[PDB]
Every structure is written in C-alpha cells, then in structure tokens.
Symmetry: C7
Subunit: 267 residues, 7 copies
Amino acid sequence: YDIKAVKFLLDVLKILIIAFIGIKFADFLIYRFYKLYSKSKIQLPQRKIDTLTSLTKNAVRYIIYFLAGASILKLFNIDMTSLLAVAGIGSLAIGFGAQNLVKDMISGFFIIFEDQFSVGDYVTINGISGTVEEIGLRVTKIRGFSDGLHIIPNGEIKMVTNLTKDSMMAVVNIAFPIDEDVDKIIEGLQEICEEVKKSRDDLIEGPTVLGITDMQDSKLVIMVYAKTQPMQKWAVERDIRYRVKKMFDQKNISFPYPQMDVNFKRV
Amino acid sequence: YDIKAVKFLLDVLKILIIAFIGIKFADFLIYRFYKLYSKSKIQLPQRKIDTLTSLTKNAVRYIIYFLAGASILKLFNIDMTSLLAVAGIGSLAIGFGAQNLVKDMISGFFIIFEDQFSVGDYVTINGISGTVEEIGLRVTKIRGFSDGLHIIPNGEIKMVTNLTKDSMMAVVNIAFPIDEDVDKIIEGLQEICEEVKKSRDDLIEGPTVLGITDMQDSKLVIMVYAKTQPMQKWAVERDIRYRVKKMFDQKNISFPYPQMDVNFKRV
Amino acid sequence: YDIKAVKFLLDVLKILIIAFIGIKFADFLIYRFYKLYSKSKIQLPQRKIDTLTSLTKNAVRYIIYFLAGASILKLFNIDMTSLLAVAGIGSLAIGFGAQNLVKDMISGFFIIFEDQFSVGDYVTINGISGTVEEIGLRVTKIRGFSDGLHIIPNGEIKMVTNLTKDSMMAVVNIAFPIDEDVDKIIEGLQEICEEVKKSRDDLIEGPTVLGITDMQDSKLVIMVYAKTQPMQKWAVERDIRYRVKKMFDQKNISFPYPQMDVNFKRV
Amino acid sequence: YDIKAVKFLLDVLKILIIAFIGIKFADFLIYRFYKLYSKSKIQLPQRKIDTLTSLTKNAVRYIIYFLAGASILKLFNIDMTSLLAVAGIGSLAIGFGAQNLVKDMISGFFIIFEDQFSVGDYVTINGISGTVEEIGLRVTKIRGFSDGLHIIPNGEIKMVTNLTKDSMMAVVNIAFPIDEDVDKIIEGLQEICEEVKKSRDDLIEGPTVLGITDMQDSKLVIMVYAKTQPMQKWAVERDIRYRVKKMFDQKNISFPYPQMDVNFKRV
Amino acid sequence: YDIKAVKFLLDVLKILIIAFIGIKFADFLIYRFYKLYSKSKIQLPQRKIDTLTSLTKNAVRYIIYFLAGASILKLFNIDMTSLLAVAGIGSLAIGFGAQNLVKDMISGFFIIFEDQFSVGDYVTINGISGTVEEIGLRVTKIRGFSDGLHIIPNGEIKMVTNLTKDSMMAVVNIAFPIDEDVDKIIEGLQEICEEVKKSRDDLIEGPTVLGITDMQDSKLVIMVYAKTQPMQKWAVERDIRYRVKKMFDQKNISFPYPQMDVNFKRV
Amino acid sequence: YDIKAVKFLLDVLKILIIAFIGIKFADFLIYRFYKLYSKSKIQLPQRKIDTLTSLTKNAVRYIIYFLAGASILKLFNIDMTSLLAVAGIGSLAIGFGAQNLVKDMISGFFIIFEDQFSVGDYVTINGISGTVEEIGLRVTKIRGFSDGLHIIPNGEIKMVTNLTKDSMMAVVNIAFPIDEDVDKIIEGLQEICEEVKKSRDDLIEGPTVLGITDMQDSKLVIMVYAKTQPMQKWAVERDIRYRVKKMFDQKNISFPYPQMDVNFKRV
Amino acid sequence: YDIKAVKFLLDVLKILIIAFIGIKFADFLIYRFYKLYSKSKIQLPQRKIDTLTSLTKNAVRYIIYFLAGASILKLFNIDMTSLLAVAGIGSLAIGFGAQNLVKDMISGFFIIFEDQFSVGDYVTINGISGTVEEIGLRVTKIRGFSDGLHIIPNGEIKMVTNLTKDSMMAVVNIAFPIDEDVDKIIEGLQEICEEVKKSRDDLIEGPTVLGITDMQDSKLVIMVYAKTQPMQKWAVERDIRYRVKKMFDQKNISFPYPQMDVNFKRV
C-alpha cells in the first residue's frame, strides 16, 4: 500500500523550494544590477531604467513559473515531449523574432570595434548618405543635409561606404560642344586649376585636368578633379563651377546647348 | 496475474486530476486578468476584451486537452516521437507564422524605448512619409498630407528617417540659363536671403546662398538653404520660391527655358 | 522459455483498443461539430461543409493510423529515431507549407481586431487600391474602380494605407508658365476657392491656396487643397479642375505649353 | 557464457518478420488503391497511373529497407543519434524541397473552396492576365489573348485580382487640348453616352461622363465609364472610342496634338 | 575485479563485423547497380558512370566510417549529444545545400508528368523565351532564336507560360494619325484580312479587325488578330505588316508621324 | 563508503586514452593526406597546402577537445541538454554559414558533370557575359570582352545561358523610313545576303531576310539573320552592317531619320 | 530514512568543484592567449585586446554559470527539456544572428586563399568599383576614385569581377552620322591607331578598329579597342578620344548631331 508518496511530496517540495530560492535570488540580482547602474545616472533616466528593470523582473518571474510548472506537470505523469511541442511555439517565435536584435548587436560591435567610421565622418550607407551623429550598439544615427535624421538599425548595413577618411575627391565634369576648340578649352581649364591651387588651402592634391573623359552626340566632357581635406569636396566643386562659368564668359566659348539639325519640306 | 493495473489507473487518474486542476486554475487566472483589466476600461471596449478573453480561454482549453490526451496515449503504449512528428506540424506552422508578430513587438519596443520619434514628428519610413498619429507596440500610424493614413507594422521598419527633430532644412534649387549673368543673380539671391531672414521668425540658421551646385547643357543651378523650426521647411521654401519669381521679374533675368539650336537645309 | 509474450499481446492490444477508442471518439466529435454548424446554415453551404467535414475525418483517420502503426512498429523493435527522420519529411513539408496559412490568420485577426479598416473604406494596400467589400479572416476583398475585384491574402499586407477615415484630402496641382503674372493667378485661384467653399457641402476644411509648391524650367506649380468628407476627394478635385479651366479662359491667362527657344543657322 | 543470443535472434527475427509483413501489406494496399482508381479511368491514363504507382511502391520499399536496416544496425550497437545526423540530411533536403508542393496544395484548396474564381472568369494574377481554363489542386491554367497559355503553380498566387464577377467597368480617358471649349466637348460626350446607352444591351450602369479627371501641360482629360456585363468591357471601350473619333470629326474639335511654342533668334 | 571487458570486446567486435559486412554488402550493391547500368550504355558514357560510381562508393565508405567510429566512441564513454552537435554542422550544411537539388527534382517530375510542355513547344519561362530542346529531370534546355541555348534548373520555374499548344495568336497593332479617316482605314484593313484569309493555310481563326484598341495624343491604334497553327504567329504578323505598308501606299493614307504644333515669337 | 570511484577513474581514464588515441590517429591521417598530395605538386603550392593542412589539424584538435571536455563534464554531473543548447549556437552558426559552400559544390558538380559548358564557350550567366576560362568546383571564371574577369561562385548560377554550342545566330535589325520603297529595299537586302553567302565560310545557315519584323511611328524594321560557326556571330553582324550602309549609299535610299511634322502659328 | 542525501551532496559538490576548476582553467587560458598576443603588438592595440579579452572572459563566465546552474536545477528535479525550450531561445537567436559572421569568414577565407584579387587590383564587386586597400578575413576595403572608401563584408560578395589581372581592355565607341563617308572615317581611325601604337608603351595588343559595331536612326558606331597594361585603360581611352576629336577637325567630318527632319503646314 505504497510508501512512495513520501518521495513524491519530497520532489514537489524540492521544485517549490528551488523555485522560491531562484525567485528571491533573481529579485536580489535585479535589485543590485539596478542600484549599481542607478546612481551613476549617465546613459539612462530613472524612467527608462524603471520600465526596463520591471521588464527584466517580469521575464524572470514568467520563466521561473513555466519551469516549476512543467516540472510539477512531469510529476503528475504529463509527457515532456508534448509539453515541448507546445512550449516550442514560443521557443520558435521568440527565438527567431529576436535574431534581428542579435544581428544588430553583432554588426554594431564590429562597426565600433573595426572603427569603420567615427562620430563625425560623412558616410553613404544603403543608398542613404549623411553625417554620423550617434554610434549606438543596436542602432546608428546619420543626419543628411536637408534629408532629416536617418536612424538605421545595424543589422541592415550591407555595405557602408565612408567618404572622408584619408581625404575626399572633388570632381567636376564640364561639358562643351564637340563643335568646339579643344586645346583652348583645356588650357583655360588648366588656368582655372592653377588659380584654384593658389587660392585654396583645403586641397591636398589637385586640381588637375584629365582628358576627354567622354564623347557623345553633340557634347564632349572633360573632367577636373582634386583631393581635398575632409568635408571640403563640395566647396571646391562649387568654386570650380563658378570659375568655369566665368571662363566660359571671358574666353568666349559656346555653351553645350543641345544641337539638332533639321531638314525642311513644305506641303 | 498482474497487480500493475493499480499503478495504471493511478496514473491515468493523476493525469485527469491534474488536467482538471489546471483547467480550473486557468479559468480563474483568465477571469482575474479579465476583471482587473475590465473596470479600468481605458485601452479596450468590453466587446474586444470579451472576444480576446474567450480566445485566451479556448487556447488554454485546447492546449490542456492536447497534453492530457497525448499523456494518456503514452499510457496505452503509443510512441511519443511519432506523436511529436505529428504535433510538430502545428509547432512549426504556428511557431513560424507568429515570428512576424514577435518581430513587430521587439521592433516596436525599441522604437518606443529609444524615442526614435514621438507622436508628432514628420517621418519618412520605407518610402512612405507622414505625420505620426499613434505609436502602438505592434503597429505605427502615420498620416501623410493627402496620402491618407498609413498603418505600418513595426517589423517592417528597415530604416526610419526622422525629419524634424533638432530642426529641419529647407532647400530651394533655382535654375538659370548658362547664358546668364552669375554675379547679378547671386547678389539678387542674397537680397532675397536678407529680406527673408528679416521677414521670418521660424528660421534658425539660413537662408544662405551656396555656389553653383550644378551645371548642365543649358542650365546652371544655384542652391539656397536654411535651417527652420520643426514643420516650417515647406512654408519657407514656398516663400523663397515666390520671392525668386518676383526677382526674376523685377531684375529682368531670363527664365531657364530649354534651349536648342538648329541647323537648316531645305529640300 | 519466456512468459513476456503476455505483456506483448497486452501492449499491442492496448494500442489497438486505444486507436479504436480514438477513432470512434473522433467520428463522434466530427459528427457533432458537423450537425451543430449544419442547421444554423449561415456562413456555409451543405456542399462545402460536406467536403470540409470529410476532409477533417480523413485527416484524423490518417493521423491515428500513423500513430498506432509507429507504436506497433516500436514493439517489433523498429527504432523510433529513424522512424522520426522519415516522418519528419512530412512534419517539415506540412509544418512549413502551412506557415502562410497561420500568418494570414494572425494578420487577419489583427486587421479585424484593431479596426484598421471597415467594410466600406477606400484603402491602398500593397500598390493596389480599392473599396473593401469583404473582410475574411484569411483573406480580404477589395474592388477598385475599373480595376476589378482584388482578393488579397492577409499575410501579404505589409502596410495598409487607409484613405477615408477622419476625412480625405483633395489636391489640385495647377501649373502656369513662369513667364506669367503670379498675383493675378493667385487672386483668381482664391476666387475659385471662395466660389467652391460656398458651392459645396462635402468639404470640411478647404479649399485653400498655398504658395509656389514647385518651380522648374518653364512652369511654376501652385497647389489648392481641401479636406473633404469620405469618398468626395475626387468629386472636389474634378470640380476645381473644371473651374480652373474656366478661369484660364475668362481671366485670359496663358496655358503652361512647353516652351523651348531655338537659335538658327542656315547651311 | 551467455544465453541472451536467444533474445538477440528473437529481435532481429522480429524486425525481419515485421518488415516482411509491412512490405506485403503495402504491396496489397498499392494494388488496391491501383485497381480501384484504374477501372474508373477518368482523370488519368494507364501510362501515368503506372509510373505513379511504380513510384509509390519504390518509395515504400526504400523507406521499409531504411527502417529495418537502421533497427538491425541499432542491434549491433550502432548509435541512433549519429544515424540520425546522417539520415537527417535526407529528412531536411526532402522535407524542405517538398514545402513548395505542400504550399501549392493548401493554396489551391482555398482557391477552389473559397470560389475565388471559376473556370471562365478573366483574372489578373501576379502581373499576368487571362481567361482561366483549368483549376487544378496544384496548378492553375490561364490563357491570355495572344499571350499564350500560362501555367501558374498555386503557391505563387500572392494576390489574385478577378475582373468579371459582379460585372466589369469599361473606361475611356479621352484627352483634348487645354486650348479647347469644355462645355461643347462635355455635351458631345454626353450625346455619345446617350447614343451608346440606347445602342447596346451589355451595359448595366453607364455610360457616364465624369469631370476633368486630369489636367496637364497642353492636354485636359475627361473620363467616360460604364458598368458592363462580364467580358464586354473592351467591346464597349472600342465602341466609345470609335464614336469619340467620329465626334471629333463632326463637331469639328481640335485633336490633342502635343503643343510647344518656340522663340527665334537668327545668328 | 570485473568480467565486463568480455561484453565490451563483444560489442566493439559487433560494431567491427557489422561495419565490415556493410562495406562488402555496399561494394557489391554498387558493383551491380554498376554493371546493370553499364552494358545498356544509353544515357551515360563509361567516363561519367565511372566518376559517379566512384563518388557513390566513397560516400558510402565515409558514412560507414563515421557510424562505426561514433559507435566505438560511444563505447569509450564519449557523449552522443556533443557528437551530435558536431556532426550536425554537416547534417545542416549538406541537408540544406541539397534542398535545391530536391526542389529541382520534384518540379521536374511535375513538368514531365503534367505534360506542361513537350520537346518542341515554344515557351516563355521566367522572362526568357525559346524552343525546348531537352527535358531533363533536374534541368530544362531551351534555345531562343539568336538568344543562344538557355539551361534552366527546374526549381527556378515560377510560372511557365507555353505559347503554341492549342494554336497561337498573331497580333498586329497598326497606328494611324487621329487626324485620319477611320472607316476608309478600317475597310482597307478588312480587305487585307480577306486577302490573307484566302492567301494562307496556317491560320485557323483570323484574320480579324477589332475596333480602336487605343487612342492617344496624335495616334489612334487598331488591332488585327488571328489564331494561327503552332509556330506560325510571326510569319503571319510579318505578312500582315508588309500588306499594311502596301495598303498605306496604294490607298494613299498618312503615316502616324509624331505631330507637334508650335507657336512663334521672334526676339 | 563507496567503491564506485573505481568505475569513475576508469571512465575518465577511458575518455582520456580515447582522446589521445584519436589525436595521434588524426595527426597521422593528416600527415598522410599531406605527403600523398604534397609530392604530386600539381593543383597547389606548398604555401597553400601548409596553411590548409594546419587548418585541418587545428579543427580536429578543437573538435576532439570539445568532445573529451563535454564527456568529462557529463561525468561531474553537468547536464548534456544545457551543454547542447550552448554548443548548438556554433552548430547553428557554422552549419548554416557553410550551406553556401555546400550549395556551390553541388551546383559545380552538376555544371561539370552535365557539361553545361566547357572551358571555351561564350556564356551569359546572371546578366553577365563572357568567355569561360576556368571551371572550378566551387567557383567559375569568365572573362568578358573589356568587362574584366568575372569570378562567380557556383551556387549563384540561377540560369546559365550558353551561346555557341551547336553554332550561334547572327542578327541584324535594319530600320528604314515607313515613307520608303519596300520591295527595292528587300531585293537589295537579298543581294547583300547572296554576296555574304558567297564571301564567307564561317556561316552554316544564312544569311536570310525575313519580313517586316516591326513597324512603328516613322520607321519599319527588317531582319536579316544567319547561323554562324561558334564565335563568329559578331564578325558576321559587323560585316552585314557595313554592307547595309554601302547599300544605303549606292541604291540611294533614305536613312531612318526621326521624322516629325509641325504646324505653325505666328504671334 | 534515506542515506542518498550523501550521493546528492556528493553530486552538487562535483558540479561545484568542476565549475570552479573550469573557471580557473579558463582564466588561465585567457590570460595566456592574452600575453602571447600582447607583446607581439602588431595587428591590435592594447585598448582593443583589453575589451576583446574582457569580452571572452565574460562569455566564458556566463556559459559556465548557465551550465552549473542548469545541472544543479536538474538535481532538484527540474526538467531539462523545458529548460531546453527556454535556453533554446538564445541558442536560436545567437546561433542564427552569428551565421552572417560565419559566412563572412568562410567567404573571406576563399577570397584570400584562391587569390581572387590582391591588395592592388581594380575590382567591381556588387555594383561598386574601386581599388582594393585592405583584405581582411571578415571584411574587404575598396577605394573608388571620388567614390570614397567602401567597406564590404565578405559574405555579401555574390560575384567579384576583377579588371586588371592579365591586362585590361580599353574601348572607345565613336559615333558618326549615317549620312557620312565610311571608308574615309575608317582609314582615319586606323591612322589614329597607328599613331597611338607608336606613341605609347602601356599597350600590349591594340589599338585596333573593328567594324560597324552598331547602326541606329541617325548614327553609326565604330569601335576601337586595345589591350593595355594594368590601370592604363582610361589613359588610353582618353588619349584616343582626344585624337578622335582632332581627327574630326582636320579631316573635316560631320559630328553625330541628332538629326530630325520636319514637314511644314502654316495655319
């Protein structure tokens, strides 16, 4: 007439005392990871830490409940494989929904750690470009000129192209009619290059004229370029453009107006 | 002649009393999570809470049924691995169909918690732009001017670019014929910048003229820009455009009409 | 000389009596879930319910067969892990092919439950727009003007933008030559706004003229807008367009004809 | 000196007699599911059923071999988890390669069961449009006018838009110069609407003129529309187009020729 | 002082004799599946069968090694779950990398079995079109006119549209100026239809004129169509085009030259 | 007072001697698979084989460590399921990161084995075209004319279209004004066909004129085509183009200059 | 009255002493893998190594905690399958989030090992082109002219096309009016080819004229090409362009101006 109900009550008593120990233990650890991060009130307000700490506490309570519960269910002869094919709906949903969060974190870790870019560089990252403002661990902030502030999760960084770095390149493609006199234009472009090499202090390499970079229908295109100091690219381009307009005027050279020629019939 | 039928009836009696205890226990917990969320009738109507609470109750009944059932099946010597390869069709279908729901909730949690944007900012989020109206946990609402109200699930937020924030940037690209007189145009643009810096109180930085931002075929393009107070961008741009038309008129300057030039043959 | 063949026949007899019990039990449950949903013949015809109920019954028969079978196979010393790596082909194929069905259902549940839109609103949902006609749980129906009836599964709803709701916005972008007289045009547009504010009862806000919304090459574009009652947007726009044509006529103002200017050589 | 070799030979004898029983059992079931589907020679030729039945038989033979084999391997002390990590290559490859097949079947089941469309409707399904010819369970056939016969697997049906159904809408967008006389044109369009309302019997709603649906550069566009009987849409549109050309002729109205205006310099 | 070393050596001896038996057994089965497929040298050269058979043999050797090895490792008290988390790297990599192969085979099976197309039809399959040359089980070959020979794996077949089949449709959209005389043109097109109905034997339905299929700016488009025998579509279209050019000539009708009209200022 | 510490030390001694045996065994196998592949120094340099063999050795050391370790951890009563949920992070990451590698190898195996193309054919493969230079097992090399050398991993081959093979097709679409005289042009094109059939030895089929392949606005297009020897396509097309220009000259035929016709107003 | 509490305290003492041993063991191994990589301060600063080593240490502490903890939880009768469905959320999230890291490493290994490109070549890799600056194991650095520095993770390398290598090809497509004299133009192009073959030392093959590579509307296009030394392509093209402009001038040949011809009506 059975004396195993003893081992039974022993076990359910073990599960209960261990779940209690675990709960108090965890409320202690959450309170400590609380107060230690609470008085050095740097990275977070006591409104966020509150909701975050409450969130941690609730997660640990529910986990501990589920565990004690399924263990005690095991004791009343419920099958743990069926219990697994039910709890595994949550294992799967959460486990996979969280993978983006983990991808963000790993990616961010390498962005920060490989110094792919620092809190001031101008970068183009996934078709969007701007000046980096914050580098978080999960998320990166980047303010374009006029574009507004872009907030990009780190997992979404396919390629990150960094302008700046070891200086930028400024480039102007100026187009003339094919029609036109090449050597005159090229000599005038070089005069602009010299005037700008003297007149600026942000440029490290150029300006330089390199040949006919392109030829098509009724226009031929020549390129001037120049290595500039970080964030000066556009200033230099705008300057070169102004001077090129001026040189179109003084040197009396035709503008690259589109140029058709038509045959006539009257009827 | 066997005296194990005792341990057998003992077991199936344990499964049944535990499934009963679990069902009553859960109907109690659902009734409490019911009435506690029921008289503080804030976020939900008693039509929604009804269907939602009925839904929870039915899910717990079906889970408990499945558990008791598979355990009793285990008792009649049915294999739990085959039972698993059957129940796992549901574990997989539900577990993965729900991963979007979980992704939404994680993403939403970070949107709210990192204050990526507040209930008033103007944001562009996945090619769609508008003024945010609700920030849920699963879903975000965003009303574009004329666009209608966009409802976006949170898991679908690749990048969220926020305009507004620390002020916007207003930009006008005005285009003149290459043909034209640069310094006159630039000086007049600066007169418009001064008149607008005086004439407005929403601007915090500009307006400012920066050089020849672009040059092509028969037009050259100059840019004025100006940091404005949140949501004033467009007002400022429209103002600057009006003034620039006016200045085209008074200063007598040619409009940037497309400009071909054609050669003739008669035949 | 063995007396375990007894426990053996006992077991296979247990598996058989349990599979029998399970089959009768389920044909009973299917017959009840049948007749209860059968005389309240609302949502389904007795041709659909027949094929659906037959389908349920066959699924339960095949599952029960597979279970009894794999258990009896376990009894003749067949390994349940190899049996698992065979049955798991079906666990995987079905479990994952069904995940879209589950995704549809979850999504649909939230569409209905968050009242994202009701059986009358005009919505644009994944590049397709129309008037919603049915809101199912798995699938949504939406009839565009001329487009035909679109049937969209719920899992395919990335964003659902809802026009209507708290009223629509009607917008007309009218374009004039840059060439033209701005204040005359604007005053005339305001006369059209006043005449339409008087002459209609669907509009709740506009009409209103806001500045030069755009300026380019040989055209400048002005915008009139107006908040209208649900589904009136287009009536209002068509009206404003008519009146704007009329105002081009009476006020004698040039149409925005594209405007080149060409230089001549003869040869 | 061991008397367990008895239980050993007993076991391998059990695995063998059970694999034999299983093979004969299955060849019987395949032969019956053969002859029963063989004399009602409706949906399949005895060339297809032959290769399909041969295919079923071989699959069951190979599965039964693998099972008996891995069980006997278990008996010579081979580990079933390593055996699992080998067989699972096939469990995974097949299990997942077959998921499209399962997706097709589920989708098709719902297409047929929700009567999303019947064997005659004209549907646009994933950018492709045509008249449905067969509705299978795995695959749908749809013949476009001139397009050829499209065969679409059911799992690939994102949205299925069905034209026809509760009648179609025929739409003509006729464009006139802005230049032109609106009320004359509108009255003439209404005369065409009346003449067509009289002259046809396939239309159920229109034809109707609704206002200036669009206005741009040198054209303004008016829309006539009309609900028609299934598959008459295009007949009605072609008719309305013919009559509109006729009305351009008789009423002497200018065609919407693109309309530039150009300024001259000679040089 | 232990007499279990006997059962130990017994076991490792069992694993060894079973791995030996399995290896000889498999080399026999590979040699037979070799010579049986070797003298009926149809589908394969004895250079392919050699490398394929060698490949099979090596796979079976390595699998048998891994099995015997992990079993003997189990015997020296190595844990099979850790062994599983190592071998499962290969289970996963291979199991999933092979899923495309399995997808190809399933898809190909259905293409062949549902006779979606035969070794002569002209099909468009995933944006690519051509005449089918081989129908494999894994891969399909399709030679476009000028395109070269396309080799498409079967798993990549989303939709397969088959032209040919129950005949093709040939279609010519001829465009006239709006300017023009409709009934003359239509009557002339019908004369071309009659002359071609007489003059060909590949057509089964047309040719036929159906109305104004389109109207825009300065062109109106009329469509002639005709059901033709498989692969004749293009011959018919080219013939109809030639005849339509001839009819433009004889009947003296204006070609659909783009038609602007321009206003002049001199300055 | 326990005499199981004996079986304990026995076990950990078994794990240690088996890990030692396994390590020496593997360093031997690596040294042999080393020296055997080392003196037939064909496919690899002794710098690659060094780093590759060192890599193999380190992988086997770490695997053997992990196994011995987890087994000894099992002995001190550490749970192997928790150990599994930790090691499985690596099982998953590696197992899935390697699936591309396996996909490449399978695909490459079939490319090589089905002789889809050989080391000289001109192929277009995923939008990129070129002449194949190497066919590896993991990766394929393909050098475009001017394009540079493309290196494509095998798993990335959706479709591979092979030009060459049973000869190429050369195609020239020449366009004339609609305006023009069709039979003259066609007869002249045939004279070019004959002159080229005589004048070349790389062509196997053409050249041939087939009708009006296209008719539009102000141009009608005729096609000449011809089956050529592998890699001659372009030579033939270039030749036919030259001759067609020559024939435009001699036969005095109008070029297909775009052809508008304009109406005039002065104001 | 139980004497198993002895084996109990024995076990938990075993778990504790093994977790202690493992912790000290690991802090030792981390300190060694620290100091050995610390004084050879090459690839890393002692700021990075610090944070990386601290990171390793913390990871191993948390893993060891989780293990000891779950083992001791197993001892108080907590179920390890439920414990597995909780820890598996992390196994899944981390295991899958890290798969990109693994993919990068494998890919990079093959890039380095197959010398697909070296630290100087000019490559186009996923639509982005530039000169390679660093080849890491996880990530590749590539600086475009003007483009800025692109940092690409290795897993994102679909195809990597390498220009340079066995020399580059420089290509110029020059276009003339159809109108024009072909043999004159071709002979002149050949004179430019000869002048450039003499005048350069970077070219290894060309320059060479090959026929009418293209013919259309009012232009015909001829191609000159030439194999050049690595990185000279563009110099050569720019030179050939300059010379071709010069040759348009001297030889007096018409530029390829777009060429319409128009018919007149006055009204």
